[PDB]
Amino acid sequence: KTHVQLSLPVLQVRDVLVRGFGDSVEEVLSEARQHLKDGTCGLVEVEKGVLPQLEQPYVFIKRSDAAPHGHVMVELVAELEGIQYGRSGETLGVLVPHVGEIPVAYRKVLLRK
Known about the structure:
The chain contains 1 helix and 7 strands, in the order E-H-E-E-E-E-E-E. By secondary structure, it is mainly beta. It has a single domain (3-112), classed as SH3 type barrels, CATH 2.30.30. A hairpin with an 8-residue loop joins strand 3 (58-63) and strand 4 (72-80). The chain is globular and about 35 Å long.
């Protein structure tokens, strides 16, 4: 399928144990997509002070369109040293590995895969 319905756990930034997916734009997009397929991906909502507490390169989920079955359609965009790789809509959050942190909410998305 070109899209997959996922329910992503929303994590508090200070709880996150593994603060990024790797060391290059290509690696973090690859790892993010793998963790989304495996059900081991969390989402941190971006506010003042969040991104400096996480590791670059960043992986964002961004709105791709204006929401089937309550799932916002999203795609992945990576960021390193102020340059983005991908072009998309509003940020829903920054993706991180999930390793058992307790979420505060879930974010239903339709991931362009």
